[PDB]
């Protein structure tokens, strides 16, 4: 028994749908399909069951078109949300339904859900300080493109910024470094062909 | 309940189960590693209380205790790096087979400090931030912790109500990691402490570290 999850990745925009797809190899005659869903945590959802001698499962905004045929479980995910971010695995049953029986599982696809579409919007650039700790903070900017820089003639050290989505849909950033001139870094922002300045604030 | 149990190689290891199971009849255990396919490595009967090991494995290696009804721990002997991963405790029914929180194994010889616990930096809101928008922005580092699996939430001080934060991607820092932590509060709660909480293995005590964000106070400027 084998289970392939061929995506290693998928990106989709909210409210769209995204299809993940797998395919088995089983000897069992009659069998279960299950698709689970792992979150960064390491938490494991169950989401669907679909059966061999059943019809397509639906539950909600999840879906399963299956073909006997080829041994094919494709899951759908309709209306995308932002939590649908995480780690899908489809599940084989040996055959399933009996207590002792194991699952044997896929390698799993993760789906990444996008941001709508929208107008472009210019962040506004704060500093916030601890010692030697300089963190850049960017607020509220569209497209998700940007080069965030710290402004400092004696770098210690500098880490990856990190954008998240806002609870408005757009994106927020933070960027932190060790700079032994830290009481006079200043941060400077190129987005959507404008320089946004943290002096500008002040 | 996501959890991590780090050792050394060569010791053992106690793994605890996370379901609240009613008249559990056999508990699976499975193995999830980076990159893996999650696998079942052996069960146990609960009626017999026998370990039923999958094809290919050594007896003794593997171990069901019960402390107490209806409570399950997975012990692993003569740990090898290899052991590392997500481990899982599951049951069929509530037919669907549910999963346990899952434990992170780490299995490590690494000489580290003998404090790897998460170590705290405060931010404070910029003034102009709070003059222009009205809400200010307090920023939680944590620094040189292992392992990895860490969770930071945000509350106010005399409320159990979980607030709206945002957080990085955990970035390794030589043989330790990093995270930071933000939250954005209005003008109307600057005049409020909050707490950012941090729940990591390698806690003082073993309990969830409690940092202190201490009100914005009011400065004339003379
Ligand atoms: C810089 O970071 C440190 C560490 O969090 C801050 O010092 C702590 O401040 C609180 C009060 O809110 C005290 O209870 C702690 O004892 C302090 N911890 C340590 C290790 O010193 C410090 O206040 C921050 N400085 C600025 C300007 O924000
Ligand atoms: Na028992
Ligand atoms: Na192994």
């Known amino acids: 028994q084998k289970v392939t999850q061929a995506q290693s990745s998928v990106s989709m925009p909210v409210r769209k749908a995204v299809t993940l797809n797998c395919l088995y190899e089983?000897?069992?005659?009659?069998?279960?399909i299950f698709w689970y869903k792992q979150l960064p945590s390491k938490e494991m959802i169950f989401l669907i069951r679909?059966?061999?001698?059943?019809q397509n499962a639906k539950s909600g905004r999840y879906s399963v078109n299956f073909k006997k045929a080829a041994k094919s479980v494709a899951l759908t995910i309709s209306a995308l949300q932002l939590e649908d971010s995480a780690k899908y695995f489809c599940?084989?049953?040996?055959?399933?339904?009996?207590?002792?029986?194991?699952?044997?599982f896929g390698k799993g696809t993760r789906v990444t859900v996008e941001p709508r579409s929208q107008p472009h919007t210019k962040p506004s650039v704060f500093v916030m300080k601890n010692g030697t700790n300089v963190a850049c903070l960017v607020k509220e900017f569209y497209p998700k493109d940007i080069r965030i820089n710290l402004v400092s003639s004696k770098k210690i050290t500098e880490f990856d910024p990190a954008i998240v989505i806002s609870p408005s849909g757009k994106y927020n950033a933070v960027k932190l470094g060790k700079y032994e001139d830290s009481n006079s870094v200043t941060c400077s922002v190129q987005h959507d062909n404008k320089t946004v300045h943290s002096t500008d604030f002040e | 309940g996501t959890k991590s149990v780090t050792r050394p190689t060569r010791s053992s290891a106690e793994i605890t189960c996370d379901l609240t199971?009613?008249?559990?009849?056999?508990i699976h255990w499975y193995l999830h590693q980076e990159g893996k396919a999650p696998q079942r490595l052996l069960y146990?009967?609960?009626?017999?209380?026998?370990?039923?090991?999958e094809s290919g494995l050594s007896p003794g290696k593997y171990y069901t205790h019960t402390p107490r009804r209806w409570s399950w721990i997975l012990i692993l002997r003569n740990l090898i790096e290899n052991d590392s991963g997500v481990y899982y405790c599951?049951?069929?029914?509530?037919?669907?087979?549910?999963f346990g929180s899952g434990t992170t194994l780490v299995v490590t010889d690494k000489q580290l400090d003998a404090d790897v616990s998460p170590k705290p930096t405060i931010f404070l809101p910029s003034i102009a931030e709070t003059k222009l928008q009205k809400a200010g922005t307090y920023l939680c580092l944590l620094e040189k912790f292992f392992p990895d699996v860490i969770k930071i939430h945000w509350q106010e001080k005399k409320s159990n109500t979980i607030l709206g934060s945002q957080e990085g991607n955990t970035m390794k820092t030589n043989d330790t990691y990093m995270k930071f932590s933000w939250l954005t509060v209005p003008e109307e709660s600057l005049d409020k402490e909050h707490r950012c909480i941090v729940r990591h293995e390698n806690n003082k005590n073993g309990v969830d570290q409690e940092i202190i964000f201490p009100p914005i106070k009011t400065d004339v400027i003379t």
């Open positions: 199971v009613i008249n559990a009849f056999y």
């Open positions: 599940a084989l049953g040996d055959p399933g339904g009996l207590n002792t029986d194991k699952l044997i």
């Open positions: 599951a049951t069929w029914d509530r037919y669907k087979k549910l």
């Open positions: 089983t000897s069992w005659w009659s069998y279960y």
């Open positions: 679909q059966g061999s001698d059943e």
């Open positions: 146990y009967d609960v009626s017999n209380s026998k370990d039923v090991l």
